[PDB]
DNA sequence: TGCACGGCTCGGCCCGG
DNA sequence: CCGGGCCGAGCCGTGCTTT
């Protein structure tokens, strides 16, 4: 099989909170707070904010938030579309990500309640996302991969490497 | 179409023996036995010499990186091109570790000496190995002095024999 | 160059090495060779189905594949006898008594 | 073929484990007199000899003398499954398999393949030992454990009516002194002033495993090897040869 | 045939430069990234030939290198082989000089190795480190696969490449 | 294991019926995979018809050539079609130059 | 084909008789003269991975403490303060800091340093308009410097002066001699190579024995008394891959035997001082105590040969000679733009100014893990000899003469590849009294 | 020059081990009445006070006063080398070496180098303490061990004839309640209700290694650091002050 | 062609004082 | 019963070179 240089089961950044093995579960169980760069999405109706694609309160799709690198002003995707992805008050091109704070305990508990998979010992993530969007992966997929003993690749697929013969 | 037929398409050994040998000395010994059995290989002078031209680069290239190496902290990942003169990481409390250890230079020295003493190699390679050993034991002259005596000496070595001859 | 642990099976164009046969088997032809399993066994199983090797004449590199229709090695036993090991089971049986491999076998090349 | 049974298999396991701390491959010389062993460590720094006469064997039958060579690690791993209240039985047939049996509340049989090792004869003449000191195991073990804190070399000084051991580090100092008036020494016989030094790793490796109620005698001199003995089951004996420092 | 990712990865950028040192005339340059080393000799040589044809059809002049450029490129090739990889091909210095003298485009790129060169501050060059992609292209493309390249030239009816045929 | 993970994903995360329903490796026969060389950006669809007891991937010579491979030492990848369809995304691709290699940005059907 | 100068014989010219001169000399420095105590571990069971780090740190400590004492000699330097206790100084005070140059960048305003000492790291800025900004522009790291200026509570230490250990401007002239004495310098003989030109060396050996052409040369030859060789006396074995085809004598024992046979032809009144180099059988990293005795015995067996170390200082008639090989020049050439191998005098003067023979660690020079730094020039000499660059040069700097003796190996394939031009068979002659080069011989006609 | 003799070195070593888990270097002031030490946490979060009057020691002879600066690790190792019934003697002569001599079956001697350490004399007089409770060391040890599982914060609550300590987490919750009818709460003097919170790491560090038969005294108040003190040998005592969190 | 080798830390289990 | 000694996973770094 194909595994990254440190093995990874979900494409979710944890930083230094998880330790050497980037264990999301160990950081969550100790109540640590991690500071990393991710993409935050915001629900248009009520106003939930966090690294998720669906709002738990109402189950409606959120919108990516654009941040100003100089003044940290947040705009929804619809608003930034008119602004040509440039800050009007400032003058700098926006970015979809910023360095933020996350509490792994709430996210992991929500995921476990979502997929009804409670008995998992380890769950490895990444130190930092390498993309330009820094969009994370759902944690439910990581939980199911950990449960079924499979590993992820740089684009989200599971691959097997073998020699070829005719 | 095809020319030759086969009874079974997956008949024969399935795993290479190279993946079941642990030590380097064991690998070299098994490979030399295999070369000795086959009539048309002529191990005794070309196999061992061409093999020695694979461990010699490792030896010489690891002694030249010990004298110009960068140090690093165990907790941090900070790399210092020269060691901190207080003995500890300036930005934390951890201790400093080498990036090229002393045992990385002389991991292939025993197999190289066996290859030199057992088989027929030109005197160039034999002298290179003897001088490499002498140079390895001379760089640490005043950091690791030989303060330990011994009961029995002369284990049929080759370097001392070459020197006394 | 020879790496430690990777044997050399024949000197350049030396009689007693691999015998050249022109042809293509069921599972060879693109860039792969055809090898009898008996000579896979009688080299201490360093060769296995799919193991690469650096060749001399046609190109540089190939993958080995079993072909039982061609000849195998001729070996000299410990008591002085000579045998033609063209069979897989015979190679398994007589492996421990081998003293010298007189001939190494064939190699089908397209 | 032979049959050997021993009482208190835990003591035999401890002895084999102590032997295993320095050497890896060794062969046993079983004869009509008993069984004996001798080997040298790969670094050629320590030499261990040990014999077990028939006196300490409850039952012992043999057709003569034979050499048996087994892997030490596997032997001690098997021996460590025993208990202090079980009997150990060693048996071998014409086949090259060493059958080991432990008889307690049940009977279990272990099969260990044999191996061949070079039985080179290594021996040395009786060197001139000017000083001899007999002390308990506990005192020397404690002295070694204190010495290990500060340095890696331990120094001996033997004087008439005064035997002392020292271990000095870079800035810290450790010293142990005793006399025959004290309770830690049995007897001392020195012919002149003696000074020597030996490493801490080897000393800790060999001294470890000695009971408190053991009489250990040490023979050493000036810049010359050291010899240590302790009696086993009141009939046997063990030797340790250690090369000096500097 | 649109399979290997040379057009997507190897060609980092295409820019137009002026011969301020000789005539202030314009020409075309190609920037090769790291991934071009995995494309293959045929892909690299075909990229060079396509660049030549596009420069011809854009009505642009020829790259006119100074001698210092030739010295810098020879030193780059030698040092790259000495300190990085075997290159599976050894161009003699005469071949390198001939290739530089007879290529109508500038084959350059970013730095891919942490080694400095001697001939620094060359005009038209914005780096002083090894350009692994460009030199690997020059070594394992037009030089290692000149037979297939001249075959393609003959099939393609392209003039100006007679030096390679010779 | 990959098929079990896909079935769990479909049943739990998305609320759809299972697809593979396999208990032994012989229950994957007739299902489709994707072959991908480590230096290309397009894949090709293949079908499983059997299993062998060797450490090689046997396939037609046209299958290996359509991935620009030579079959003398090369190694490629196979992944289940549905896994790649559900999981692959272009927003997880690194932003350096060598980030679009090994990615199935398009697949060939014939 | 195994000629090794077996039967080379050169006899003294009876037409000329040497004059009588008292042989007053002594070796003032040798690496196998300082007893370096090995360092002990911080606990009872330390291992290999910490003793090496401790030894390197102790070496750097010794370097800093040795080069800090030299700086505080000229009265112009005063009010030295500890770097650690810089937060407790007023903004109107003038202080000096002494430490190691970690790094040196360049900005539009000037240069920024990372000076470090025993008690912490401090940043330093030097304005572009400073009078000494030119000197500090071409200093390479790991050297010991002094900075003078005003400290700020906001970090940066603004400075207006820059100091090197340097050489004093004033010195007292030594008393003269009763008669003149001459000495000769040679380096990089490279015995056993194909590009080594033996005929030129035989002509030179003939020249030393009275085979002269002019009256003044005859007078000099009758007066010569000493001879110093500065490394690379044999081509060595296994220096680079593919050297076997480049060797005429592919045996290190035979290389040293042939070299010993060649040098035996000099008159018995000439005393050799031989030092090892980077191609001999000697220590992989500098300083090198001596040759490997079991490999270089024939040159030890010479009756008039005295084997010295690298670096070593020799005193002849009260004149100090700092004899070194010169592996440290390559770092100076690489780091400071505007210098080339063809002119090694300027890099040598820079090394003398810094008072260290190989400042930077981790570059092109291998530095051994010693507890004491023996490469610092403690005492200022009268003459300095070097080699390793195969190019002749000579300069004078504040009273001391800096000489770079040439090679005897003709240009090889590699030196052609890297565009290096050797100047073989050039030999400088030095007068003992003034410690200055007075004549340069030339035997390049044969080579 | 002073000579101080102590009996039962194990208790001394245990006390030193508890005192050495907060600061690495501390200074001891030897004076006729006794030895007193007041260290400071490196992060400035917990206070530790030492007081060892001369009444405990069997022999106590000293003239004048002197400070003794030593690093905790070496002294802790030397003391932990002491066995159950080893007499502990502390002696300092004219030299700059702090001698630790141990007496028993053998005379084992250790030496340490004194280190100059700055002294920060900050005396804290009596503070307004809302409530004071004395409980057995077993109860607090067990409660801290139980609360370490759920979270990193302990909440202390004291009321009229009621002592309650609670820890809360994301999902789990632990609470321990005590009152006069239990064997742990010896008595409780409280003028008014109070509540405060403290860290679990520091609490475990201070509370670890406390004997079961110890009348540990706890005093604390609303949003105010807790004071803890227990007696040693009926004459000596140790005092802990831990700053609160948030 | 890149993998193969050394070293440091950090818990989970015995096993013993 | 409570405290060490020890293994077994993991995670980092490194592999000829003339002046
Ligand atoms: Mg291929
Ligand atoms: Mg030279
Ligand atoms: Mg040299
Ligand atoms: Zn919502
Ligand atoms: Zn802004
Ligand atoms: Zn650090």
Curated annotation (Swiss-Prot), chains D, H:
Keywords: DNA replication, DNA-binding. GO terms for molecular function: DNA binding; DNA polymerase processivity factor activity. It comes from the Archaea. The keyword DNA-binding applies. Pfam families: PCNA_C (PF02747), PCNA_N (PF00705). GO terms for biological process: leading strand elongation; regulation of DNA replication. Belongs to the PCNA family. Sliding clamp subunit that acts as a moving platform for DNA processing. Responsible for tethering the catalytic subunit of DNA polymerase and other proteins to DNA during high-speed replication. Regulates activity of NucS endonuclease and prevents non-specific cleavage. NCBIfam families: pcna (TIGR00590), PRK01115.1-2 (NF002219), PRK01115.1-4 (NF002221). The subunits circularize to form a toroid; DNA passes through its center. Replication factor C (RFC) is required to load the toroid on the DNA. Homotrimer. Interacts with NucS. This is DNA polymerase sliding clamp. It comes from Pyrococcus abyssi (strain GE5 / Orsay). The lineage of its organism: Archaea, Methanobacteriati, Methanobacteriota, Thermococci, Thermococcales.
Curated annotation (Swiss-Prot), chain G:
Belongs to the DNA polymerase delta/II small subunit family. GO terms for molecular function: DNA binding; DNA-directed DNA polymerase activity; single-stranded DNA 3'-5' DNA exonuclease activity. One of its GO terms (biological process) is DNA strand elongation involved in DNA replication. Possesses two activities: a DNA synthesis (polymerase) and an exonucleolytic activity that degrades single-stranded DNA in the 3' to 5' direction. Has a template-primer preference which is characteristic of a replicative DNA polymerase. It catalyses: DNA(n) + a 2'-deoxyribonucleoside 5'-triphosphate = DNA(n+1) + diphosphate; Exonucleolytic cleavage in the 3'- to 5'-direction to yield nucleoside 5'-phosphates. One of its GO terms (cellular component) is DNA polymerase complex. Keywords: DNA replication, DNA-binding, DNA-directed DNA polymerase, Exonuclease, Hydrolase, Multifunctional enzyme, Nuclease, Nucleotidyltransferase, Transferase. Heterodimer of a large subunit and a small subunit. The chain holds residues 173 to 619 of 619 of the full protein. The gene is polB. This is DNA polymerase II small subunit. Its EC number is 2.7.7.7, 3.1.11.1.
């Amino acid at each position: 099989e194909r595994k990254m240089k440190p093995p990874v089961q979900v494409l979710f950044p944890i930083g230094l909170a998880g330790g050497s093995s980037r264990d999301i579960k160990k950081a969550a169980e100790e109540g640590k707070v991690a500071e990393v760069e991710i993409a935050f999405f915001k629900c248009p109706k009520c106003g939930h904010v966090g690294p998720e694609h669906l709002c738990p309160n109402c189950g409606t799709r959120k919108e990516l938030l654009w941040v100003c690198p100089r003044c940290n002003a947040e705009y929804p995707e619809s608003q930034a579309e008119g602004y040509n992805y440039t800050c009007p008050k400032c003058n700098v091109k926006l970015r979809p990500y910023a360095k933020r704070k996350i509490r792994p305990s709430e996210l992991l508990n929500r995921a476990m309640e979502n997929v009804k998979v409670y008995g998992v010992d380890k769950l490895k993530g990444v130190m930092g996302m390498t993309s330009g969007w820094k969009m994370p992966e759902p944690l439910e997929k990581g939980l199911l991969r950990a449960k079924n003993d499979v590993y992820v690749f740089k684009d989200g697929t599971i691959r097997f490497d073998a020699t070829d013969a005719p | 179409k095809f020319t030759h037929d086969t009874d079974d398409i997956a008949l024969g050994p399935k795993m290479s023996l190279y993946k079941q040998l642990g030590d380097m000395e064991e690998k070299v010994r098994r490979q030399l036995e295999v070369a000795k059995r086959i009539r048309a290989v002529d191990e005794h002078g070309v196999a061992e010499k061409i093999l020695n031209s694979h461990l010699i680069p490792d030896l010489r290239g690891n002694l030249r990186s010990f004298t110009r190496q960068e140090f690093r902290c165990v907790k941090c990942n900070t790399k210092f091109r020269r060691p901190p003169l207080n003995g500890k990481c300036p930005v934390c409390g951890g201790k400093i570790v080498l990036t090229v250890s002393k045992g990385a230079i002389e991991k292939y020295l025993g197999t190289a000496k066996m290859l030199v003493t057992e088989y027929n190699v030109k005197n160039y390679t034999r002298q290179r190995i003897c001088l490499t050993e002498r140079d390895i034991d001379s760089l640490f002259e005043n950091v690791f002095p030989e303060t330990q005596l011994t009961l029995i000496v002369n284990p049929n070595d080759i370097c001392q024999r070459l020197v006394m001859a | 160059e020879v790496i430690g642990g990777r044997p050399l099976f024949s000197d350049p164009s030396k009689p007693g090495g691999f015998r050249l046969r022109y042809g293509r088997s069921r599972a060879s032809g693109f860039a792969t060779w055809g090898i009898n399993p008996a000579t896979m066994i009688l080299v201490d199983e360093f060769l296995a189905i799919g193991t690469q090797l650096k060749t001399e004449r046609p190109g540089k590199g190939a993958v080995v594949t079993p072909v039982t229709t061609i000849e195998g090695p001729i070996v000299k036993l410990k008591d002085g006898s000579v045998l033609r090991v063209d069979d897989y089971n015979l190679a398994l049986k007589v492996r421990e008594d081998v003293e010298e491999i007189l001939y190494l076998g064939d190699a089908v090349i397209a | 073929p032979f049959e050997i049974v021993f009482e208190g298999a835990k003591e035999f396991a401890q002895l084999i484990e102590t032997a295993s701390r320095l050497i890896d491959e060794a062969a046993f010389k079983v004869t009509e007199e008993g069984i004996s062993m001798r080997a040298m460590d790969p670094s050629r720094v320590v030499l261990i000899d040990l014999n077990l006469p028939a006196s300490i064997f409850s039952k012992y039958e043999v057709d003569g003398e034979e050499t048996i060579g087994v892997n030490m690690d596997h032997l001690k791993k098997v021996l460590k499954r025993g208990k202090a209240k079980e009997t150990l039985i060693l048996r071998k047939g014409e086949e090259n398999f060493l059958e080991i049996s432990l008889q307690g509340t049940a009977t279990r049989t272990f099969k260990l393949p044999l191996i061949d090792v070079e039985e080179i004869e290594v021996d040395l003449p009786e060197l001139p030992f000017t000083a001899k000191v007999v002390i308990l195991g506990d005192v020397i073990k404690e002295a070694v454990k204190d010495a290990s804190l500060v340095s890696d070399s331990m120094k001996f000084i033997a004087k008439e009516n005064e035997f002392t051991m020292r271990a000095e580090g870079e800035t810290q100092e450790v010293e142990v002194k005793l006399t025959l008036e004290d309770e830690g020494l049995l007897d001392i016989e020195v012919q002149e002033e003696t000074k020597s030094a030996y490493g801490i790793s080897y000393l800790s490796d060999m001294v470890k495993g000695l009971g408190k109620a053991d009489e250990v005698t040490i023979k050493f001199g000036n810049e010359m090897p050291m010899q240590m003995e302790y009696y086993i089951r009141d009939e046997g004996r063990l030797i340790f040869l250690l090369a000096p420092r500097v | 045939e649109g399979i290997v990712s040379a057009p997507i990865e190897g060609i980092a950028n295409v820019k137009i430069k002026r011969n301020t040192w000789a005539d202030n005339s314009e020409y075309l340059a190609l920037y090769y990234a790291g991934p071009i080393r995995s494309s293959g000799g045929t892909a690299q040589a075909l990229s060079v030939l396509v660049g030549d044809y596009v420069r011809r059809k854009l009505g642009l002049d020829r790259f006119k290198p100074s001698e210092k450029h030739i010295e810098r490129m020879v030193e780059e090739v030698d040092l790259y082989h000495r300190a990085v990889t075997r290159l599976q091909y050894h161009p003699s210095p005469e071949e390198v000089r001939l290739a530089m003298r007879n290529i109508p485009i500038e084959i350059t790129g970013e730095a891919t190795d942490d080694v400095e060169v001697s001939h620094r501050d060359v005009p038209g060059v914005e780096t002083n480190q090894l350009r692994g992609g460009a030199i690997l292209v020059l070594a394992e493309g037009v030089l290692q696969k000149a037979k297939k390249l001249v075959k393609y030239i003959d099939k393609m009816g392209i003039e100006g490449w007679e030096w390679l045929k010779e | 294991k990959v098929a079990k993970f896909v079935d769990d994903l479909l049943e739990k995360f998305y609320g759809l019926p299972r697809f593979y329903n396999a208990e032994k490796m012989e229950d994957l026969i007739g299902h489709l995979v994707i072959g991908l060389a480590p230096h290309t950006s397009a894949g090709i669809v293949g079908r499983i018809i059997g299993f062998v007891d060797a450490l090689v991937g046997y396939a037609h010579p046209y299958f290996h050539a359509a991935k620009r491979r030579n079959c003398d030492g090369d190694e490629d990848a196979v992944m289940l079609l549905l896994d790649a369809l559900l999981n692959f995304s272009r927003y997880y691709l690194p932003e350096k130059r060598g980030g679009k290699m090994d990615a199935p940005l398009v697949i060939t059907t014939r | 084909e195994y000629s090794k100068y077996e039967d080379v014989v050169i006899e003294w010219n009876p037409s000329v008789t040497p004059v009588q001169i008292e042989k007053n000399y002594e070796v003032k420095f040798d690496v196998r003269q300082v007893k370096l105590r090995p360092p002990k571990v911080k606990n009872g069971s330390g291992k290999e991975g910490e003793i090496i780090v401790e030894a390197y740190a102790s070496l750097f400590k010794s370097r800093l403490s040795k080069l800090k004492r030299i700086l505080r000699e000229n009265p112009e330097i005063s009010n030295v303060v500890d770097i650690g206790k810089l937060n407790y100084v007023s903004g109107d005070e003038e202080v000096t800091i002494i430490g190691l140059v970690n790094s040196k960048r360049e900005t539009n305003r000037g240069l920024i340093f990372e000076v470090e000492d025993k008690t912490g790291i401090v940043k330093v800025f030097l304005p572009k308009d400073s009078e000494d900004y030119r000197e500090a522009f071409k200093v390479l790291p790991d050297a010991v410097v002094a900075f003078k200026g005003f400290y700020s509570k906001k970090g940066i230490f603004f400075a207006n002066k820059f100091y090197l250990p340097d050489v004093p401007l004033y010195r007292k002239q030594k008393p003269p001699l009763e008669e003149k004495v001459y000495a000769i310098l040679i380096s990089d003989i490279h015995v056993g190579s194909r590009e080594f030109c033996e005929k030129a060396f035989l002509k030179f050996l003939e020249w030393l024995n009275g085979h002269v052409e002019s009256k003044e040369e005859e007078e000099i030859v009758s007066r010569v008394k000493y001879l110093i060789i500065a490394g690379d006396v044999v081509d060595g074995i296994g220096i680079y891959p593919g050297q076997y085809s480049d060797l005429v004598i592919p045996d290190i024992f035979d290389q040293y035997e042939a070299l010993a046979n060649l040098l035996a032809n000099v008159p018995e009144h000439i005393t050799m001082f031989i030092g090892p180099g980077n191609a001999d059988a000697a220590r992989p990293a500098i300083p090198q105590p001596e040759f490997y005795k079991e490999y270089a015995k024939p040159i030890y067996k010479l009756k008039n040969a005295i084997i010295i170390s690298n670096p070593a200082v020799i005193r002849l008639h009260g004149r100090d000679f700092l004899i070194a090989h010169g592996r440290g020049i390559e770092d100076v050439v690489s780091f400071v733009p505007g210098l080339t191998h063809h002119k090694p005098g300027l890099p040598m003067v820079e090394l003398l100014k810094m008072r260290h023979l190989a400042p930077t660690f981790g570059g092109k020079v291998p530095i051994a893990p010693d507890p004491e730094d023996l490469l610092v020039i403690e005492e200022v000499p009268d003459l300095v000899q070097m080699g390793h660059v195969h190019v002749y040069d000579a300069v004078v700097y504040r009273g001391v003469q800096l000489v770079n003796s040439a090679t005897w190996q003709a240009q090889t394939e590699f030196q052609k590849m890297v565009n290096i031009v050797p100047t073989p068979a050039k030999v400088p002659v030095v007068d003992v009294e003034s410690a200055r080069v007075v004549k340069v011989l030339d035997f390049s006609g044969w080579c």
